[PDB]
Amino acid sequence: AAWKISIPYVDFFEIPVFCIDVEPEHWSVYRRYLEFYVLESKLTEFHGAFPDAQLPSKRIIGPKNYEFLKSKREEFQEYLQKLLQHPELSNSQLLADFLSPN
């Protein structure tokens, strides 16, 4: 996974979602706030616990706030980006699955 990702915006599934563009091959995937936290949970389970690569404290929000997802947009982007930089994860199906279309 020498993949490049960005989270240009947050969108709606009608339900506010993160839109991730992935790189010349390209596509986008839609991920719910919660989906990130289970990703991090599982990844940490099978691969350890990369400092630097840390999701912010999970908020005890309810569906649905748009503006809140908008604000975490950058942090979440940084997370995935720093994730992709570690090896060991370069072969994680978990990560790959997370980043695959829709």
Residue 22, domain CATH: 3.30.1520.10
C-alpha 99: how far from chain center: 8
Q: How many separate domains does the chain show?
A: 1
Write the DSSP symbol of residue 15.
Answer: -
Resolution in A: 3.0
Q: Is the dihedral of CA 78, 75, 94, 50 positive or negative?
A: positive
Rounded distance between C-alpha atoms, residue 52 and residue 79, angstroms = 8
Rounded distance between C-alpha atoms, residue 33 and residue 85, angstroms = 22
Domain of 28? 1-102
Tokens of 63: 């569906």
Which of 60-82 are b and which e, b meaning 16 or more Cβ less than 10 Å from the residue's Cβ? eeeeeeeeebeebbeebbebbee
Smallest CA-to-CA distance from 22 within 83, 80, 91 is with: 80
Question: What end-to-end distance do the CA atoms of the chain give, in Å?
Answer: 18
